[PDB]
Amino acid sequence: TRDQNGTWEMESNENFEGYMKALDIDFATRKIAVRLTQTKVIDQDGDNFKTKTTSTFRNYDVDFTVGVEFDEYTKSLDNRHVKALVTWEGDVLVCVQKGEKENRGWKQWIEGDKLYLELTCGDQVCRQVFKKK
Template identity: 70%
Template sequence: TKVIVQNGDTFETKTLSTFRNYEVNFTVGVEFEEHTKGLDNRKVMTLVTWDGDKLVCIQKGEKENRGWKQWLEGDLLHLEITVAGKLCHQVFKKVQ
């Protein structure tokens, strides 16, 4: 389950699952230190920006070419995660 609360360019996001939970809050255009505790336990510098109607994240740390993109299409949330040239595309459906 993904929970996303948007207030202008400020986002509160939660990813909830049986195995682990993760929360990250950010403001678009403001770089911040992110600790991916509960995921893969990395410390990275993260910058999220807008590219049209997509949120684009670039993470700088021990692995190159790492980040994600998120966008809405109707009631679907698309998430593309990139790591070292590999791509994972996930689609979430909005609960009514």
């Protein structure tokens, strides 16, 4: 019962606002982290501790096979059903999400050491660049 190893997901959080008010936190950071699920990973070796605490919102996951249509229920996002299809266009992973919203989809490729992702919906395009870890 002294070995507290493992990954821990927060399920309840009581009086977190008051604890941050007593520590004098810049309000904006308080209201951001007041409704975020914390996750603590503990690496304990007898008496040596290596703990890592993260504060996250929503983690979105999806599994697919390139070329196989699948019904994607984008929960946590817009909560809609879309007929999703992912194909290869050269070395660019392209996906089309057939649904109520038109021009919905995303591109994803890799140039060198960075991964690019261009989300598209209607007439708005979001571009994201990711570095490797």
